[PDB]
């Protein structure tokens, strides 16, 4: 009875050096949640890039919460060519019954300048 977040745009194409920004919108039910940003390595191995609430202790991956309590920007700062890949966001339903329910994944294309 809890909906997963959605991850848009489907295909984000940017020129190298520019910042590429994703939007994961999560309509939380109760504020005991956490959103995570993932990048799929070879053989479907998920690496956590950043998260909200921001740990604040790579800094090129930042998560910003919009004035509405739904939309979030995951922005790569100064995107490189090797940042092209498959990305997705996931919500973990901690306290109680911790469950990672994932969004649909999105593709990032970084083109030559």
């Amino acid at each position: 009875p809890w909906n997963p977040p959605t991850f848009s745009p489907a295909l984000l194409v940017v020129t190298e050096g520019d910042n590429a920004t994703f939007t994961c919108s999560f309509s939380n039910t109760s504020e005991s949640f956490v959103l995570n940003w993932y990048r799929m390595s070879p053989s479907n191995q998920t690496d956590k890039l950043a998260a909200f609430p921001e740990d604040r202790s790579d800094c090129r991956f930042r998560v910003t919460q919009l004035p509405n309590g739904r939309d979030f920007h995951m922005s790569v700062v100064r995107a490189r060519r090797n940042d092209s890949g498959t990305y997705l966001c996931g919500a973990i339903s901690l306290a109680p019954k911790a469950q990672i329910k994932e969004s649909l994944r999105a593709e990032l294309r970084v083109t030559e300048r």
Partner: antibody
Amino acid sequence: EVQLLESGGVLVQPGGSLRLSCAASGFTFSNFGMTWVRQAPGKGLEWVSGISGGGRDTYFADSVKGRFTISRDNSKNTLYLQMNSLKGEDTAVYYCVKWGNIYFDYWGQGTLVTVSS
Amino acid sequence: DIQMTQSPSSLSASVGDSITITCRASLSINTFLNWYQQKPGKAPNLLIYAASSLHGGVPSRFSGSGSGTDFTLTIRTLQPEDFATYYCQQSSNTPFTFGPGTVVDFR
């Protein structure tokens, strides 16, 4: 860096009441939930209570529910644990813990609460 | 309630040995295990989250594995600043329950 400073641990007689305070500094306190974890003298770690971070959601263990109250005041970056109907069993070292994820990042050095006559 | 158990209860080893300690849960949690190190008179420190992820600043020799009910902590090259008590803690279901703890001693 991140520091959690517990205060208020004093010798209290059984049946009394005491409120513990945690001074949070080094991170956005309002964005993270918090928990209290106690270690009884000679015993293991036991989870006491948890707060959502915005204060709307509260979680309690069976051993303290109805007797302990979890609260937070993000204005001054302080976490409170109101301990009522104290028992001798409740004598433990109470740790202020940074919640907000699967895992418990940082632990304060704790405050000692002794319940005896 | 999910009851957590650990084995061994106590451990004696010298510097350089490889140590593997286990943690078992009464029912499946599948990743939601944490490993903590407590030194005497001090607050516990986080080592492993999600049962295999290394917390920032923890030496790479510390490693965790396992899913479901059985998990393991591994210390590849034991060093003097590692002799302490280790607890495992499940985060799948409230209330959060800890393991009895495993004491690592100097021999």
